[PDB]
Amino acid sequence: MTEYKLVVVGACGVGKSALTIQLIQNHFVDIEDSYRKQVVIDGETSLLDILDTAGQEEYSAMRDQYMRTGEGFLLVFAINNTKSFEDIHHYREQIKRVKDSEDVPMVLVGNKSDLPSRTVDTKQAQDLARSYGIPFIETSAKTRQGVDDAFYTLVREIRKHKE
Amino acid sequence: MTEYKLVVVGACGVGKSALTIQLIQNHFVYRKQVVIDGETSLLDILDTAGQEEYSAMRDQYMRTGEGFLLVFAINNTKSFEDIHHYREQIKRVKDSEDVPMVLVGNKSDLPSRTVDTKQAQDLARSYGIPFIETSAKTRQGVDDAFYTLVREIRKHKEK
Amino acid sequence: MTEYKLVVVGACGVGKSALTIQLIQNHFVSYRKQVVIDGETSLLDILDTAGYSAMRDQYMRTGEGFLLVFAINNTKSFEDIHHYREQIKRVKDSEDVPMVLVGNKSDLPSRTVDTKQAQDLARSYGIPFIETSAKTRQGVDDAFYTLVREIRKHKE
Ligand SMILES: Nc1nc2c(ncn2[C@@H]2O[C@H](COP(=O)(O)OP(=O)(O)O)[C@@H](O)[C@H]2O)c(=O)[nH]1
Ligand SMILES: Nc1nc2c(ncn2[C@@H]2O[C@H](COP(=O)(O)OP(=O)(O)O)[C@@H](O)[C@H]2O)c(=O)[nH]1
Ligand SMILES: Nc1nc2c(ncn2[C@@H]2O[C@H](COP(=O)(O)OP(=O)(O)O)[C@@H](O)[C@H]2O)c(=O)[nH]1
Ligand SMILES: *CCS(=O)(=O)NC1CCN(C(=O)CNc2cc(I)c(Cl)cc2OC)CC1
Ligand SMILES: *CCS(=O)(=O)NC1CCN(C(=O)CNc2cc(I)c(Cl)cc2OC)CC1
Numbered sequence: 001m002t003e004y005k006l007v008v009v010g011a012c013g014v015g016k017s018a019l020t021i022q023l024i025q026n027h028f029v030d031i032e033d034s035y036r037k038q039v040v041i042d043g044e045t046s047l048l049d050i051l052d053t054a055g056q057e058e059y060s061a062m063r064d065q066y067m068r069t070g071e072g073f074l075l076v077f078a079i080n081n082t083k084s085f086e087d088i089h090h091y092r093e094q095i096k097r098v099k100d101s102e103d104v105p106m107v108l109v110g111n112k113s114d115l116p117s118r119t120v121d122t123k124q125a126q127d128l129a130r131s132y133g134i135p136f137i138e139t140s141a142k143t144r145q146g147v148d149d150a151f152y153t154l155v156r157e158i159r160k161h162k163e
Numbered sequence: 164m165t166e167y168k169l170v171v172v173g174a175c176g177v178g179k180s181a182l183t184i185q186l187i188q189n190h191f192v193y194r195k196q197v198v199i200d201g202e203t204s205l206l207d208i209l210d211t212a213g214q215e216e217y218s219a220m221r222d223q224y225m226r227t228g229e230g231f232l233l234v235f236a237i238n239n240t241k242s243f244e245d246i247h248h249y250r251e252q253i254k255r256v257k258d259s260e261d262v263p264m265v266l267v268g269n270k271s272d273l274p275s276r277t278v279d280t281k282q283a284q285d286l287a288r289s290y291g292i293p294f295i296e297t298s299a300k301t302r303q304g305v306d307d308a309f310y311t312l313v314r315e316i317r318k319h320k321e322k
Numbered sequence: 323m324t325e326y327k328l329v330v331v332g333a334c335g336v337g338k339s340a341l342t343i344q345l346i347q348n349h350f351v352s353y354r355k356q357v358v359i360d361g362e363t364s365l366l367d368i369l370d371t372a373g374y375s376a377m378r379d380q381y382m383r384t385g386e387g388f389l390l391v392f393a394i395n396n397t398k399s400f401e402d403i404h405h406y407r408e409q410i411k412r413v414k415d416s417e418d419v420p421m422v423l424v425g426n427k428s429d430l431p432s433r434t435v436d437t438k439q440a441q442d443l444a445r446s447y448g449i450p451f452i453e454t455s456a457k458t459r460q461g462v463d464d465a466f467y468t469l470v471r472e473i474r475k476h477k478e
């Protein structure tokens with residue numbers, strides 16, 4: 001069966017685990033960092049294998065393995081965390097180095113879109129995604145806004161790369 | 164608040180009018196304010212009645228519209244076969260290879276299906292657009308089809 | 323059979339005659355037409371004023387309901403609606419006159435009077451607003467039937 005190895009990267013606290021729980025287990029509570037589930041996306045059955053990582057957790061060799069084999073990456077920031085948005089370039093540069101490629105499937109995700117506290121403008125994030133040549137999706141793990149779209153868009157980006 | 168000009172296309176009798184009436188009036192026998200992904204918007208579904216038969220008028224509607232529902236009926240093989248030509252005509256007339264569109268397989272309530280979900284999904288996957296199965300009769304998929312189209316138009320505007 | 327006396331008013335060129343002929347004869351270029359409205363056979367007498375104080379006063383006083391027609395591509399015709407409304411209320415000597423606001427030519431691309439503007443004016447007057455195209459027939463029966471409904475509410 002087709003498998004997609006996905007890695008969700010971003011600063012601590014941006015909602016990577018919440019987003020992944022919402023996708024996989026369909027709920028939110030306001031915790032596992034790996035997940036595996038069979039889904040159907042655009043009529044194609046596949047298994048999603050997902051790691052959530054900020055880059056400084058304990059199991060660094062495991063993380064390096066997942067980084068090297070990851071077929072697509074969600075770059076997650078929170079709309080109420082300017083530092084998390086500033087960290088996105090670092091995470092993208094690290095992915096490109098480990099993958100040794102300038103063409104790695106990625107999607108930019110602005111999470112916590114339900115909150116009224118915003119310090120990152122949607123235009124700023126759109127502009128950054130445009131410069132990187134990747135999709136930008138606004139999400140809320142709390143309301144489910146954009147969640148399926150973020151992960152399924154990343155799967156579609158991987159398919160583009162494979163074909 | 165942002166307005167989105169939407170056009171429903173597809174073969175005669177596939178249920179374009181019925182989908183529009185279900186969306187706006189919540190009934191099975193052209194403007195609606197809705198909140199999609201936290202943003203309140205106005206949907207303006209262009210009223211093509213009494214003028215749909217004129218190619219010149221379809222051209223005008225295609226030029227005006229920001230996004231398109233490509234509607235076939237799941238019990239009408241020909242209507243599904245006609246989708247590609249309609250999509251090609253919209254691209255030509257709008258002089259664009261990037262026009263927001265959603266594929267819609269209507270009349271999902273019927274027993275007599277001749278277009279399978281896989282054929283339609285395969286089509287949509289090749290186009291890189293969403294596919295939604297609807298029924299204007301039971302309301303299945305109707306808000307989802309229109310709301311999804313608005314999401315496709317927003318993506319295109321923000322590229 | 324209950325008879326209703328309907329008067330179609332509005333600026334020159336807005337489609338008063340075209341609306342009335344579509345209603346009566348069902349094609350796109352007083353008249354009488356028998357219709358069934360809300361289950362009830364209804365004789366409609368319709369004066370198209372497309373063609374003087376004495377004349378005005380008679381048909382305004384005799385008329386039971388009024389279609390206030392503007393064209394959606396004719397800002398002046400929309401501005402003129404207040405002239406017509408005020409004159410009818412003055413001559414009839416009534417603050418409760420059955421009326422419907424009609425925005426015709428909905429088939430056109432060139433709209434300079436927005437739907438919201440017209441809805442807001444009709445809300446101010448406490449009357450319905452109906453968009454029509456005498457060309458495609460969209461809305462035509464609705465505009466006239468709504469007016470009959472307004473006359474019945476007044477009569478009850
Ligand atoms: N309002 C809101 N809170 C969220 C959302 N996503 C995550 N959270 C909360 O933010 C905190 C951090 O989330 P978590 O998933 O642990 O972040 P991670 O370190 O990136 O995995 C938790 O208290 C979550 O409930 C969201 O979309 N909206
Ligand atoms: N069973 C069923 N009938 C439908 C549905 N949608 C439309 N119809 C019927 O299909 C016929 C054509 O619909 P219409 O809206 O006039 O199609 P249009 O020509 O595409 O606008 C009418 O008899 C509708 O009542 C649907 O979802 N289910
Ligand atoms: N496009 C369009 N033209 C119309 C419509 N109604 C009337 N017309 C045209 O507008 C012009 C004036 O119409 P007419 O009925 O004579 O206006 P009147 O003076 O108010 O009676 C004519 O050329 C009509 O054919 C309509 O709904 N759409
Ligand atoms: C029901 C028969 S009809 O002749 O009244 N209407 C036909 C006209 C031809 N047709 C289509 O072109 C369907 N696709 C379509 C509809 C519209 I409205 C627009 Cl703007 C564009 C397209 O295709 C690009 C079927 C219905
Ligand atoms: C271009 C057409 S015209 O030369 O014949 N002049 C028009 C101008 C618009 N018009 C009216 O406003 C008629 N007013 C009117 C007549 C009657 I009879 C009644 Cl009951 C009411 C009104 O307006 C309140 C007609 C001719």
